[PDB]
Design a protein around this motif. Structure first.
Motif, PDB file in Angstrom:
ATOM      1  N   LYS A   7      28.360  92.963  11.674  1.00 11.48           N
ATOM      2  CA  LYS A   7      29.362  93.602  12.804  1.00 11.48           C
ATOM      3  C   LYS A   7      29.012  93.027  14.272  1.00 11.48           C
ATOM      4  O   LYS A   7      28.012  93.359  14.688  1.00 11.48           O
ATOM      5  N   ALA A   8      30.063  92.493  14.813  1.00  8.17           N
ATOM      6  CA  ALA A   8      29.759  91.640  16.227  1.00  8.17           C
ATOM      7  C   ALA A   8      30.561  92.553  17.280  1.00  8.17           C
ATOM      8  O   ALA A   8      31.790  92.777  17.188  1.00  8.17           O
ATOM      9  N   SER A   9      29.598  92.952  18.341  1.00  7.05           N
ATOM     10  CA  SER A   9      30.094  93.735  19.489  1.00  7.05           C
ATOM     11  C   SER A   9      31.590  93.024  19.947  1.00  7.05           C
ATOM     12  O   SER A   9      31.375  91.551  20.230  1.00  7.05           O
ATOM     13  N   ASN A  10      32.373  93.348  20.265  1.00 11.61           N
ATOM     14  CA  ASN A  10      33.753  93.360  20.618  1.00 11.61           C
ATOM     15  C   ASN A  10      33.854  93.444  21.959  1.00 11.61           C
ATOM     16  O   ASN A  10      34.869  94.419  22.402  1.00 11.61           O
ATOM     17  N   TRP A  11      33.089  92.859  22.864  1.00 12.67           N
ATOM     18  CA  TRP A  11      33.299  93.380  24.264  1.00 12.67           C
ATOM     19  C   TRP A  11      34.562  92.850  24.942  1.00 12.67           C
ATOM     20  O   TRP A  11      35.092  91.692  24.517  1.00 12.67           O
ATOM     21  N   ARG A  12      35.057  93.575  25.815  1.00 12.12           N
ATOM     22  CA  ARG A  12      36.163  92.902  26.810  1.00 12.12           C
ATOM     23  C   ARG A  12      35.623  91.648  27.586  1.00 12.12           C
ATOM     24  O   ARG A  12      34.527  91.957  28.032  1.00 12.12           O
ATOM     25  N   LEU A  13      36.200  90.736  27.535  1.00 12.84           N
ATOM     26  CA  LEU A  13      35.790  89.560  28.200  1.00 12.84           C
ATOM     27  C   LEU A  13      36.392  89.255  29.534  1.00 12.84           C
ATOM     28  O   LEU A  13      37.608  89.313  29.713  1.00 12.84           O
ATOM     29  N   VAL A  14      35.412  88.728  30.305  1.00 10.81           N
ATOM     30  CA  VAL A  14      36.051  88.195  31.808  1.00 10.81           C
ATOM     31  C   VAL A  14      36.669  87.043  31.696  1.00 10.81           C
ATOM     32  O   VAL A  14      35.781  85.963  31.196  1.00 10.81           O
ATOM     33  N   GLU A  15      37.763  86.877  31.667  1.00 10.85           N
ATOM     34  CA  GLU A  15      38.452  85.622  31.398  1.00 10.85           C
ATOM     35  C   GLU A  15      40.049  85.712  32.117  1.00 10.85           C
ATOM     36  O   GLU A  15      40.634  86.591  32.526  1.00 10.85           O
ATOM     37  N   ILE A  57      37.453  89.741  44.260  1.00 10.86           N
ATOM     38  CA  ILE A  57      36.476  91.047  43.857  1.00 10.86           C
ATOM     39  C   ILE A  57      35.496  90.957  43.177  1.00 10.86           C
ATOM     40  O   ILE A  57      35.138  89.961  42.485  1.00 10.86           O
ATOM     41  N   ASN A  58      34.609  91.955  43.604  1.00  8.62           N
ATOM     42  CA  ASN A  58      33.379  92.086  42.792  1.00  8.62           C
ATOM     43  C   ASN A  58      33.644  92.914  41.401  1.00  8.62           C
ATOM     44  O   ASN A  58      34.360  93.774  41.410  1.00  8.62           O
ATOM     45  N   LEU A  59      33.135  92.463  40.320  1.00 10.49           N
ATOM     46  CA  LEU A  59      33.433  92.920  39.023  1.00 10.49           C
ATOM     47  C   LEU A  59      33.167  94.457  39.082  1.00 10.49           C
ATOM     48  O   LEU A  59      33.909  95.114  38.212  1.00 10.49           O
ATOM     49  N   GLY A  60      32.316  94.728  39.738  1.00 10.74           N
ATOM     50  CA  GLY A  60      31.509  96.183  39.508  1.00 10.74           C
ATOM     51  C   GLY A  60      32.626  97.158  40.163  1.00 10.74           C
ATOM     52  O   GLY A  60      32.550  98.223  39.983  1.00 10.74           O
ATOM     53  N   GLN A  61      33.720  96.520  41.015  1.00 11.64           N
ATOM     54  CA  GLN A  61      34.740  97.832  41.550  1.00 11.64           C
ATOM     55  C   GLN A  61      36.090  97.645  40.560  1.00 11.64           C
ATOM     56  O   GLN A  61      37.006  98.195  41.174  1.00 11.64           O
ATOM     57  N   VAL A  62      35.668  97.195  39.469  1.00  4.96           N
ATOM     58  CA  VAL A  62      36.865  96.889  38.501  1.00  4.96           C
ATOM     59  C   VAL A  62      36.533  97.517  37.172  1.00  4.96           C
ATOM     60  O   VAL A  62      35.451  97.428  37.039  1.00  4.96           O
ATOM     61  N   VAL A  63      37.866  97.959  36.370  1.00  6.29           N
ATOM     62  CA  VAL A  63      37.231  98.234  34.917  1.00  6.29           C
ATOM     63  C   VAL A  63      38.028  97.271  34.080  1.00  6.29           C
ATOM     64  O   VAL A  63      39.195  97.440  33.855  1.00  6.29           O
ATOM     65  N   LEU A  64      37.376  96.311  33.223  1.00  7.69           N
ATOM     66  CA  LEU A  64      37.995  95.650  32.179  1.00  7.69           C
ATOM     67  C   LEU A  64      38.929  96.540  31.069  1.00  7.69           C
ATOM     68  O   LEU A  64      38.324  97.642  30.812  1.00  7.69           O
ATOM     69  N   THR A  65      40.033  95.977  30.891  1.00  2.96           N
ATOM     70  CA  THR A  65      40.873  96.925  30.026  1.00  2.96           C
ATOM     71  C   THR A  65      40.757  95.944  28.597  1.00  2.96           C
ATOM     72  O   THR A  65      40.612  94.751  28.841  1.00  2.96           O
TER      73      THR A  65
ATOM     74  N   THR D 145      33.340  75.141  33.396  1.00  5.58           N
ATOM     75  CA  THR D 145      33.964  74.527  32.011  1.00  5.58           C
ATOM     76  C   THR D 145      35.173  75.214  31.447  1.00  5.58           C
ATOM     77  O   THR D 145      35.645  76.066  31.950  1.00  5.58           O
ATOM     78  N   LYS D 146      35.645  74.413  30.434  1.00  6.50           N
ATOM     79  CA  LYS D 146      37.189  74.862  30.164  1.00  6.50           C
ATOM     80  C   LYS D 146      37.222  76.182  29.279  1.00  6.50           C
ATOM     81  O   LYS D 146      36.300  76.393  28.481  1.00  6.50           O
ATOM     82  N   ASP D 147      38.241  77.067  29.455  1.00  5.26           N
ATOM     83  CA  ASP D 147      38.422  78.257  28.988  1.00  5.26           C
ATOM     84  C   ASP D 147      37.188  79.026  28.982  1.00  5.26           C
ATOM     85  O   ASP D 147      36.822  79.389  27.856  1.00  5.26           O
ATOM     86  N   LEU D 148      36.613  79.496  30.012  1.00  3.78           N
ATOM     87  CA  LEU D 148      35.268  80.044  30.284  1.00  3.78           C
ATOM     88  C   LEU D 148      35.518  81.229  30.042  1.00  3.78           C
ATOM     89  O   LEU D 148      36.245  82.136  30.786  1.00  3.78           O
ATOM     90  N   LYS D 149      34.818  82.062  29.102  1.00  7.12           N
ATOM     91  CA  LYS D 149      34.707  83.445  28.943  1.00  7.12           C
ATOM     92  C   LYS D 149      33.418  84.202  28.833  1.00  7.12           C
ATOM     93  O   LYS D 149      32.524  83.442  28.238  1.00  7.12           O
ATOM     94  N   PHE D 150      33.154  85.308  29.209  1.00  8.39           N
ATOM     95  CA  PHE D 150      32.015  86.244  28.901  1.00  8.39           C
ATOM     96  C   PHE D 150      32.133  87.576  28.722  1.00  8.39           C
ATOM     97  O   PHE D 150      33.206  87.954  29.647  1.00  8.39           O
ATOM     98  N   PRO D 151      31.328  88.247  28.382  1.00  7.45           N
ATOM     99  CA  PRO D 151      31.342  89.793  28.263  1.00  7.45           C
ATOM    100  C   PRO D 151      30.398  90.134  29.376  1.00  7.45           C
ATOM    101  O   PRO D 151      29.932  89.253  30.142  1.00  7.45           O
ATOM    102  N   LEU D 152      30.342  91.369  29.685  1.00  2.48           N
ATOM    103  CA  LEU D 152      29.387  92.005  30.462  1.00  2.48           C
ATOM    104  C   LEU D 152      28.644  92.998  29.624  1.00  2.48           C
ATOM    105  O   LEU D 152      29.093  94.259  29.949  1.00  2.48           O
ATOM    106  N   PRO D 153      27.804  92.753  28.870  1.00  2.37           N
ATOM    107  CA  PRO D 153      27.058  93.740  28.034  1.00  2.37           C
ATOM    108  C   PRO D 153      26.340  95.021  28.727  1.00  2.37           C
ATOM    109  O   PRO D 153      26.021  94.511  29.958  1.00  2.37           O
TER     110      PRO D 153
END
Ligand SMILES: [Mg+2]
Ligand SMILES: [Mg+2]
Ligand SMILES: [Mg+2]
Ligand SMILES: [Mg+2]
Ligand SMILES: [Mg+2]
Ligand SMILES: [Zn+2]
Lengths: 137, 143, 191, 172, 52
Positions: A7-15, A57-65, D145-153
RNA sequence: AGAACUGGCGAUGCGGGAUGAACCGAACGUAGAGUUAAGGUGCCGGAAUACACGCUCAUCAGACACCACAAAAGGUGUUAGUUCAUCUAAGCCGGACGGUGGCCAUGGAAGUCGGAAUCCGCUAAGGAGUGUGUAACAACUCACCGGCCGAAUGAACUA
RNA sequence: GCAGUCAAGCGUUCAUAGCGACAUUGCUUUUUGAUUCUUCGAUGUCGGCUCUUCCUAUCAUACCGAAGCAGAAUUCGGUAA
């Protein structure tokens, strides 16, 4: 078992295209989209529809949905709007528990004293019919 | 330069393709200090042998895609270390003169270059017996 | 400098199944099954297919990143141990008093027992680790052979056996007696 | 030395009957208010021309606003600075939305890593880097890099109250 | 007594080592620095000395 | 221990520096309300377990002027930087070798005790046997060795 | 008084096993000076005896790493009061 299970943690990605909910400030409460990543801590966002001004913006004042939509990176405000709309982002958000609880909590807070009273009386009614049920099966 | 020097190998090699008609690629994988080399002066009225660093050796090839594309068929045999006998004829006798230098246990050939072909080498023309009795052997089998 | 992602890869060979949940890894193959707790490192696993599982660190500094490969390896040796297996070989080396080595037991226990080391009246005992199994070569003089699925447990049990014969108060360049690791490799697949 | 604005400062030597109309010199200065900026103008001019502000005058001072304050750029930054034991030139890169934003992180970074306070640094040049991969520095290339994404654990939410009736999670 | 090859075996352990010159640690023979914190991870190493 | 100018202490409480003649702030009738200084705001304790970018892990971390000490010198700990060199014609795995024990010396003396030079050279490897064994054969095995290789790489440095 | 850094030299050969010149950075406060802050309407000198406790720069004893450690004997060094 006999498959390898992982099982792999399914994090909301900053993208680019990730949609975020703004915690703090003047745009507090509103949705914006990540347009371009600045570093591990900052991003460019833009919330044309909610009228939150394209800004770094700084990511800390935002929450990923969990929502995300297709958006080319760097996209200017005009095309952010076109795309956000095409994607029906608000539709999806509104449908979530998350957005619903916010709405619920908002509505409660606006209740009049008279209204608070009616909720009491109605609750007592529901209760009643419930306790007799919870007693029959 | 060292890209001069990279090029340098390229420069001369192409030149040697364009200076001989045959080419024997003899494998020069392993084998090393003093012996063979000193026989080669004596055998340099027939050939140039060139030992050299491999990625360099490969990139020479890349520069020769321009023409003479039959050297592409050398390419799967670039592997390890190989070395050149730029050459005109015999490829099956003269070759064997070149081969003989004192074995080790055949010093040390393991590949052949024969102008788009890769013999033992040991058969190429000796009686025209694949052209008067084997260019008409299913003409023989059926008239 | 913080590396935004950095990852390694774990080939799963035919016949084995690795399953991981909150960093507790279970690896199962023809030889048996090993498990290992990886909780002490923040790494994240991800199965691409049944041949291949990936491991990443997200946004990690040097020392964190150093943990990545090492996780890969540990998990690699789990897979090897349960397919090819591990085998370490040792040799008794002694200039004069022959080192006399046997298996003995107490409470169904099992010890490697070493006698006469440099002519010592004392007896040395080394518990045989669970999972690791001891043989004695038939056709190499003074050989001793430890094997099993766990390199960790085989290798430590070999280390225990050599550390128990150290030679105290003597120039240890002249007095070289001991049991030393002489070869190490696999159970299956030649020697 | 704070939240930075960037100014054009333009000055000159006072006119003499001998030289009315003396040559005009400009600097771009990063500072927080204009009193600092003109100070800074003179500090540099004095190290570059014979002039003290007692013999010169400031002709114009104008804030230069970022042209594209929401395009993300990668900036090359050139800096001279003093260490406890000497003085050094140094090239660094910064990814940001404005020079003024970049310069401010330059100052925090010189403070964090080299213990350089503001008095000890000169900004030599600051420049948008045109072509990606003229970018030289890993820790900025990483983002390109192209299509850059990362989580914030491992997300830690701040709590509004002192006790909580559930054990929190870090799930993002 | 002791075949050449086992004397060699024994030596990988007993003598093919280097030594920290500040703190005396027995160190890997190709090492560059001492592993020990007490000597400051010095790179002042010497070979362990060979018998007669 | 002894001079110069000024400001202090002595003759002076008050707020800060835990403490403290002399530092910082500020000098003093009896009080009310407001605002600050220097200094602080996890808890002791009045005041954000505030916001922001980094850096740091110490089997002897560190933590604030006067001030209650530390140096030369070292570190393949980790950070950021510099210079030189390689590379679209980081960096990795193997090629580092013959004429000429060349020419002075002298078991050897070669690049390889020592003296003075180091000129040219060419591009491919089986030790009359390492051991078992035989007084000596047979058999198996290994030596100038590497597949190299895939937008960075190597070296020397700064703090 | 005690401990370092550099390494010319010692050490048959070999700088650094053990040492170490020219220089050079320090530490200690059981030496001796320098000072004169406290005490001259008082703080009872030297040594010993007796007895407790503390320091560690460790002489012995425990376990180790070095060696110009073959063995025995020693010497250098660590954790150690
Ligand atoms: Mg100024
Ligand atoms: Mg000046
Ligand atoms: Mg300076
Ligand atoms: Mg300056
Ligand atoms: Mg100071
Ligand atoms: Zn050490």
């Amino acid at each position: 078992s006999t498959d390898s299970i992982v099982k792999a943690s399914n994090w909301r990605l900053v993208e680019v295209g990730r949609v975020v909910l703004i915690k703090k400030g003047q745009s507090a409460g509103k949705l914006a989209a990540i347009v371009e990543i600045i570093d591990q801590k900052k991003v460019l966002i833009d919330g044309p529809k909610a009228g939150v001004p394209r800004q770094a913006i700084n990511l800390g004042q935002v929450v990923l949905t969990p929502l995300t939509f297709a958006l080319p990176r760097g996209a200017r405000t005009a095309t952010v709007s076109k795309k956000w709309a095409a994607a029906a982002v608000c539709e999806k958000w509104a449908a979530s528990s998350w957005a619903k609880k916010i709405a619920q909590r908002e509505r409660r807070a606006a209740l009049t004293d008279f209204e608070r009273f009616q909720v009491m009386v109605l609750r007592k009614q529901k209760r009643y019919t419930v306790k007799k049920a919870l007693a029959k099966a | 330069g060292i890209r001069e020097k990279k090029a340098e190998y390229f420069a001369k090699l192409r030149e040697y393709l364009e200076e001989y008609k045959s080419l024997f690629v003899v494998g020069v994988d392993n084998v090393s200090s003093q012996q063979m080399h000193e026989v080669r002066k004596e055998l340099r009225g027939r050939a140039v042998v060139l030992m050299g660093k491999n990625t360099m050796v490969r990139r020479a090839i890349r520069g020769f895609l321009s023409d003479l594309p039959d050297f592409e068929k050398l390419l799967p045999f670039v592997k390890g270390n190989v070395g050149f006998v730029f050459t005109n004829e015999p490829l099956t006798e003269i070759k064997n003169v070149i081969v003989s230098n004192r074995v080790a246990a055949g010093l040390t050939v393991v590949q052949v270059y024969d102008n788009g072909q890769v013999f033992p080498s040991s058969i190429l023309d000796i009686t025209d017996e694949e052209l008067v009795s084997h260019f008409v052997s299913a003409v023989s089998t059926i008239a | 400098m913080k590396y935004i992602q950095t990852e390694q890869q774990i080939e799963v060979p035919e016949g084995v199944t690795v399953s991981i949940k909150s960093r507790i890894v279970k690896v199962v193959g023809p030889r048996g099954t090993l498990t290992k707790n990886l909780k002490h490192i923040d790494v994240t696993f991800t199965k691409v297919n049944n041949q291949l599982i990936k491991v990443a660190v997200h946004n990690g500094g040097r020392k964190h990143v150093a943990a990545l490969r090492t996780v890969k390896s540990l998990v690699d040796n789990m897979i090897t141990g349960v397919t090819k297996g591990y085998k370490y070989k040792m040799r008794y080396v002694y200039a004069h008093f022959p080192i006399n080595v046997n298996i003995v037991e107490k409470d169904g226990a099992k010890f490697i027992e070493v006698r006469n080391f440099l002519g010592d009246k004392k007896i040395r005992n080394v518990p045989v680790r669970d999972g690791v199994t001891i043989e004695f070569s038939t056709n190499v003089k003074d050989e001793i052979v430890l094997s099993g699925n766990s390199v960790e447990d085989v290798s430590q049990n070999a280390a225990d056996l050599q550390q128990i014969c150290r030679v105290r108060n003597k120039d240890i360049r002249k007095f070289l007696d001991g049991i030393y690791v002489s070869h190490k490799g696999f159970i299956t697949e030649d020697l | 030395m704070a939240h930075f604005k960037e100014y054009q400062v333009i000055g000159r030597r006072l006119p003499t009957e001998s030289v009315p109309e003396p040559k005009l010199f400009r600097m771009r200065i990063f500072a927080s208010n204009e009193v600092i900026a003109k100070s800074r103008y003179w500090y540099f001019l004095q190290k570059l021309h014979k002039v003290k502000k007692a013999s010169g005058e400031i002709v114009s001072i104008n804030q230069i606003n970022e042209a594209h304050p929401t395009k993300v750029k990668n900036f090359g930054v050139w800096v001279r600075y003093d260490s406890r034991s000497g003085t050094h030139n140094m090239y660094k890169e910064i990814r940001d939305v404005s020079r003024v934003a970049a310069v401010e992180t330059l100052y925090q970074d010189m403070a964090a890593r080299h213990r350089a306070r503001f008095r000890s640094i000169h900004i030599l040049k600051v420049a948008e880097i045109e072509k990606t991969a003229d970018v030289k520095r890993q820790y900025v290339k990483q983002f390109l890099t192209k299509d850059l994404k990362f989580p914030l654990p491992h997300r830690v939410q701040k709590s509004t109250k002192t006790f909580s009736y559930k054990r929190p999670s870090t799930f993002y | 007594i002791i075949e050449p090859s086992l004397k060699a075996l024994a030596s990988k352990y007993n003598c093919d080592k280097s030594v920290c010159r500040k703190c005396y640690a027995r160190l890997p023979p190709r090492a560059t620095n001492c592993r020990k914190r007490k000597c400051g991870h010095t790179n002042q190493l010497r070979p362990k000395k060979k018998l007669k």
